[PDB]
Amino acid sequence: MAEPLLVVGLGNPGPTYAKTRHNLGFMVADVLAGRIGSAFKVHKKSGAEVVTGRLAGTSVVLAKPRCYMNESGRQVGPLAKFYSVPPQQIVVIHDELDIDFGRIRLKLGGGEGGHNGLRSVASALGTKNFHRVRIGVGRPPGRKDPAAFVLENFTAAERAEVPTIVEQAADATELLIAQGLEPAQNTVHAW
């Protein structure tokens, strides 16, 4: 009827760290907005920025937070009620330390493996279990801090494959609308 897909990208506007391994969450949003050709406008209330469009046959709302990890969690809450969301589906792209760098892990709702945003957004609305997009960041480091390793975007092979995996990630996000969950994840893990 008129229910949109709520896409929250875990990627806050940070001058230098928006280009690092932790930009995965923001990548999908930026890419979708990029292919559609629209910029996200500031919602003068919570300080977040959202862009509107249509993916496949459903309204897509790409929402990114103002700043800070904790803030991002409660960013989704007042916004979903702000425009009054008809619950179609909520997609939240985030970092995943347990998954190999370059591939997508799809789980329903909240779970371990990520840091803050993915966990916070679940409690902000109270409704989860849809599509929580986990982009593998590689593996836990042996020397530097795990999060610091996500702050340094350098690798051997997969470091060059970023554009490829990001385009597919954003593209598969639309497939989650048109196809579903099971045949969709099958498509994602077939390559």
Side-chain angles (χ1 to χ4, degrees), residues 91-139:
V91 176
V92 179
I93 306 82
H94 65 278
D95 57 287
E96 232 274 53
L97 296 174
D98 200 78
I99 299 303
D100 177 55
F101 193 10
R103 299 183 185 162
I104 307 172
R105 183 185 186 174
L106 295 177
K107 189 173 183 177
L108 296 179
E112 314 85 271
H115 281 96
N116 300 90
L118 63 156
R119 299 172 65 180
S120 302
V121 298
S123 304
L125 296 181
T127 305
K128 58 286 172 192
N129 296 331
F130 290 95
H131 276 127
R132 206 60 68 233
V133 179
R134 303 179 172 219
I135 303 180
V137 73
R139 268 186 167 174

Side-chain angles (χ1 to χ4, degrees), residues 20 39 53 57 66 68 74 79 90 103 107 120 132 150 176:
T20 196
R66 55 177 301 214
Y68 193 54
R74 63 176 183 152
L79 287 184
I90 176 180
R103 299 183 185 162
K107 189 173 183 177
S120 302
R132 206 60 68 233
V150 187
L176 303 177

Side-chain angles (χ1 to χ4, degrees), residues 1-6 54 57-60 83 85-89 177:
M1 56 176 182
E3 51 283 276
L5 175 65
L6 182 62
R54 282 288 270 223
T58 305
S59 307
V60 61
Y83 68 92
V85 57
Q88 174 57 29
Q89 184 182 149
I177 291 295

Side-chain angles (χ1 to χ4, degrees), residues 165-188:
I165 62 176
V166 173
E167 284 295 334
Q168 287 297 329
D171 204 73
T173 302
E174 188 184 279
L175 185 64
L176 303 177
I177 291 295
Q179 188 66 330
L181 53 93
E182 183 180 80
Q185 67 179 30
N186 181 272
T187 301
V188 180

Side-chain angles (χ1 to χ4, degrees), residues 4-26:
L5 175 65
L6 182 62
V7 185
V8 180
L10 185 61
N12 287 273
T16 192
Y17 61 89
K19 294 78 174 298
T20 196
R21 278 175 163 142
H22 202 210
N23 78 333
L24 300 175
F26 185 75

